[PDB]
């Protein structure tokens, strides 16, 4: 099996992770993914600080306690032309992307390549980090601690 993880630059430590090119991360997998990056699900305050430093996406992703989308510039297909952090009302079983907060990141924008999942563990999956510059970093292992996430493929 292969898992591809597309990662953005970090803004006040917050970054966006998309798995396998589609909305595919469960609530339980999201926290495990951030922890494999030595990171945590952001608080809303952390997300708002990231937004003030230049962070926006056009994707829903988990934070602590909610699924959200951060917007700086109005775009009609990203939270329907709104700005700010908007919260998605959703079932707890739906899959999205995830956001993560790294406490050792710089306060501003950090676009250096991410080269490892430092807290991955043993397993059979080839896990590939895909950076904005096109470089990719692969290792064999696992990061999911919930068997339900592994069984759901």
């Amino acid at each position: 099996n292969q898992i591809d993880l597309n990662v953005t630059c970090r803004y006040a430590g917050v970054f966006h992770v998309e798995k396998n090119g589609r909305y595919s991360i469960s609530r339980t997998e999201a926290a495990d993914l951030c922890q494999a990056f030595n990171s945590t699900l952001p608080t809303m305050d952390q997300m708002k600080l990231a937004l003030s430093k230049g962070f926006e996406t056009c994707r829903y992703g988990f934070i602590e306690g909610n699924v959200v989308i951060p917007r700086i510039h109005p775009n009609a297909i990203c939270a329907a032309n709104h700005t700010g952090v908007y919260i998605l009302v959703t079932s707890n079983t739906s899959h999205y992307d995830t956001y993560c907060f790294n406490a050792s990141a710089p306060p501003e924008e950090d676009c250096t390549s991410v080269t490892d999942l430092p807290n991955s563990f043993d397993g059979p999956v080839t896990i590939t980090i895909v950076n904005r510059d096109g470089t990719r970093y692969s290792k064999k292992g696992e990061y999911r601690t919930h068997q339900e996430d592994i069984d759901a493929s």
Binding site: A76, I77, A79, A80, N81, H82, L88, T90
Partner: protein
């Protein structure tokens, strides 16, 4: 030609969705069918809710977007259509979007099962209210 008939404002909030929140639905409504077999579909708008909100629709054909729609509503008016933006590079085969309404015409040769292969992803976001920290 099919076009929305504006309903009276019946509700002034969106059930279960507060300012600062969005919700998404993937569905479509059959607006009309013609004697020639062509069907006309719409995004699944709730047409009697007058709340300050903005909405996007995306026409999804076999899980690929063909273009997007923008709407707004207010305390004074139900959802109002503000245009379609195509995103497809190939010409559509057996499909045509009416730029005046955002409705999707499906000619009979496009597919035998349009209801299974096509939907609109409709996202409604209830506009945040300005308050103090």
């Amino acid at each position: 030609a099919p076009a929305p008939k504006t309903n009276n404002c019946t509700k002034f909030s969106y059930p279960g969705v507060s300012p600062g929140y969005c919700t998404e639905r993937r569905d479509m409504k059959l607006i009309t069918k013609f004697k020639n077999g062509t069907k006309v579909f719409s995004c699944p708008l709730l047409t009697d809710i007058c709340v300050n909100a903005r909405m996007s629709g995306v026409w999804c054909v076999n899980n690929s977007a063909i273009g997007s729609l923008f709407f707004t509503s207010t305390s004074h008016t139900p959802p109002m259509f503000h245009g379609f933006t195509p995103t497809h590079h190939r010409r559509l085969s057996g499909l045509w979007v009416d730029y005046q309404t955002g409705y999707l015409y499906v000619y009979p040769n496009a597919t035998k099962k349009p209801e299974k292969e096509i939907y609109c992803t409709l996202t409604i976001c209830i506009t945040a209210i300005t308050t103090r920290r």
